[PDB]
Design an enzyme around this catalytic site. Structure first.
Site, mmCIF file in Angstrom:
data_model
loop_
_atom_site.group_PDB
_atom_site.id
_atom_site.type_symbol
_atom_site.label_atom_id
_atom_site.label_comp_id
_atom_site.label_asym_id
_atom_site.label_seq_id
_atom_site.Cartn_x
_atom_site.Cartn_y
_atom_site.Cartn_z
ATOM 1 N N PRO B 1 14.476 -9.850 -1.707
ATOM 2 C CA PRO B 1 14.248 -8.640 -1.420
ATOM 3 C C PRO B 1 14.929 -7.500 -2.492
ATOM 4 O O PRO B 1 15.409 -8.231 -3.460
ATOM 5 C CB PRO B 1 15.594 -8.504 -0.323
ATOM 6 C CG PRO B 1 15.434 -9.915 0.167
ATOM 7 C CD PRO B 1 15.144 -10.898 -0.725
ATOM 8 N N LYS B 32 18.969 -13.964 2.947
ATOM 9 C CA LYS B 32 17.969 -14.500 1.965
ATOM 10 C C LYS B 32 19.020 -15.118 0.774
ATOM 11 O O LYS B 32 20.252 -14.485 0.506
ATOM 12 C CB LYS B 32 17.131 -13.526 1.389
ATOM 13 C CG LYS B 32 16.321 -12.589 2.211
ATOM 14 C CD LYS B 32 14.896 -13.555 2.224
ATOM 15 C CE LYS B 32 13.851 -12.645 2.977
ATOM 16 N NZ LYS B 32 12.623 -13.229 3.541
ATOM 17 N N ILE B 64 10.511 -9.424 2.586
ATOM 18 C CA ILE B 64 9.748 -10.284 3.367
ATOM 19 C C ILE B 64 10.123 -10.734 4.618
ATOM 20 O O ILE B 64 11.107 -11.651 4.644
ATOM 21 C CB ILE B 64 9.116 -11.554 2.229
ATOM 22 C CG1 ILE B 64 8.415 -10.907 1.229
ATOM 23 C CG2 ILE B 64 8.057 -12.518 3.322
ATOM 24 C CD1 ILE B 64 8.193 -11.981 0.103
ATOM 25 N N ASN B 97 14.601 3.965 3.543
ATOM 26 C CA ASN B 97 13.343 3.527 3.708
ATOM 27 C C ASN B 97 13.326 1.824 3.673
ATOM 28 O O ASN B 97 13.530 1.353 2.796
ATOM 29 C CB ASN B 97 12.221 4.071 2.835
ATOM 30 C CG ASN B 97 12.004 5.531 2.952
ATOM 31 O OD1 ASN B 97 12.400 5.920 3.988
ATOM 32 N ND2 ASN B 97 11.721 6.106 1.881
HETATM 33 O O1 LIG Z 1 14.231 14.028 10.580
HETATM 34 C C1 LIG Z 1 14.199 12.815 9.985
HETATM 35 C C2 LIG Z 1 13.464 12.386 8.897
HETATM 36 O O2 LIG Z 1 12.452 13.295 8.535
HETATM 37 C C3 LIG Z 1 13.495 11.115 8.313
HETATM 38 C C4 LIG Z 1 12.891 10.444 7.375
HETATM 39 C C5 LIG Z 1 13.331 9.321 6.382
HETATM 40 C C6 LIG Z 1 13.100 8.888 5.144
HETATM 41 C C7 LIG Z 1 11.576 9.071 5.300
HETATM 42 O O3 LIG Z 1 10.958 8.413 4.243
HETATM 43 C C8 LIG Z 1 10.960 9.965 6.254
HETATM 44 C C9 LIG Z 1 11.503 10.517 7.118
HETATM 45 O O4 LIG Z 1 10.724 11.522 7.998
HETATM 46 O O5 LIG Z 1 14.560 10.159 8.669
HETATM 47 C C10 LIG Z 1 15.240 10.569 9.789
HETATM 48 C C11 LIG Z 1 16.341 9.670 10.363
HETATM 49 C C12 LIG Z 1 17.048 9.804 11.466
HETATM 50 O O6 LIG Z 1 17.893 8.943 11.824
HETATM 51 C C13 LIG Z 1 17.011 11.040 12.038
HETATM 52 C C14 LIG Z 1 16.006 12.079 11.663
HETATM 53 O O7 LIG Z 1 15.884 13.427 12.203
HETATM 54 C C15 LIG Z 1 15.395 11.841 10.352
HETATM 55 CL CL LIG Z 2 12.029 -10.550 -0.023
#
Ligand SMILES: O=c1c(O)c(-c2ccc(O)cc2O)oc2cc(O)cc(O)c12
Ligand SMILES: [Cl-]
Ligand SMILES: [Cl-]
Ligand SMILES: [Cl-]
Ligand SMILES: [Cl-]
Lengths: 114, 114, 114
Positions: B1, B32, B64, B97
């Site tokens: 990772p 992992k 993964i 993310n």
């Molecule tokens: O409005 C959000 C947001 O744009 C995003 C967001 C975060 C990362 C990304 O790549 C895209 C997103 O829209 O995440 C949130 C996570 C939460 O727990 C609550 C939220 O209101 C958001």
């Molecule tokens: Cl991995």
């Protein structure tokens, strides 16, 4: 396509012409025209691989198509070879993430490719 | 990772051992082996969260497998807790993310995991 | 949402308030409150576009929803316009990758959006 290399190798160890070599080699490997290839190298990074601070690289290749099982194996051999020969990074300390992009999700020149 | 943290916190405020700590914590959290864990910390960034440049972080965890609703909730508490304790970044100023990578799309050691 | 721009334009050419301008324009474009918009600008990068080191940018916009063919075309026109007017980067030297994130795969504030 877009190829990014993040590495803890220092800036001074990235040889002159490295970005042009990446551009041309990706053109050959992916078959894509060099005009459509963007490359980005980020040296001097604070990174670890397996907990070790020995030279390593985290990379990504985003492409509309030309991504797949066999193709990604070939890119990995080509790109790891370049990183080993030019940046002296061992291939088992390189990750490359591959991304097959939908044309609708790539913006360029005020529009998208879709 | 692979775990990456981009933050506007200055380099001097990233404590010694942070990469070692992240490696060890992610090994246990993802299950992992540590050998497969790569970590990347990028301080001193020009960033804003909610329009303000108080301490914040944008992170990504690529794996993964071992990615999913419940697992990502657990990672988020773990990682926000670490960023809050070690980098003094409030959890409401951190985005993470999560990427469940197909083995065919992760290159390593001249090949892919597929 | 989260917007990242990597560029070879120097730090001094990023105007004061650029992060706030991006914050407000993306808040309007995505319809989400500015408190949830995160922006990351990375100048002085070692990059090439088409083999050339003239000013260029590699960007990503990640959003939970509000990603699609027509919206991404509109985002691209908006974001290329700002990069051209503010950073003097030609729109045919800008790539923007769009990511429609699943609610389960975004962490924030010890939680996930899901
Ligand atoms: O409005 C959000 C947001 O744009 C995003 C967001 C975060 C990362 C990304 O790549 C895209 C997103 O829209 O995440 C949130 C996570 C939460 O727990 C609550 C939220 O209101 C958001
Ligand atoms: Cl991995
Ligand atoms: Cl492409
Ligand atoms: Cl994948
Ligand atoms: Cl997703």
């Amino acid at each position: 396509p877009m190829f990014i290399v993040n590495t803890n190798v220092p800036r001074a160890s990235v040889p002159d012409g490295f970005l042009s070599e990446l551009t041309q080699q990706l053109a050959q490997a992916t078959g894509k025209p060099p005009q459509y290839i963007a490359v980005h190298v980020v040296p001097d990074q604070l990174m670890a691989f397996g907990g070790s601070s020995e030279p390593c690289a985290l990379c990504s290749l985003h492409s509309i198509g030309k991504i797949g099982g066999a193709q990604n194996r070939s890119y990995s051999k080509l790109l790891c070879g370049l990183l080993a020969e030019r940046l002296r990074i061992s291939p088992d300390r390189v990750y490359i993430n591959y991304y097959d992009m939908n044309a609708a999700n790539v913006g360029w020149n005020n529009s998208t490719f879709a």
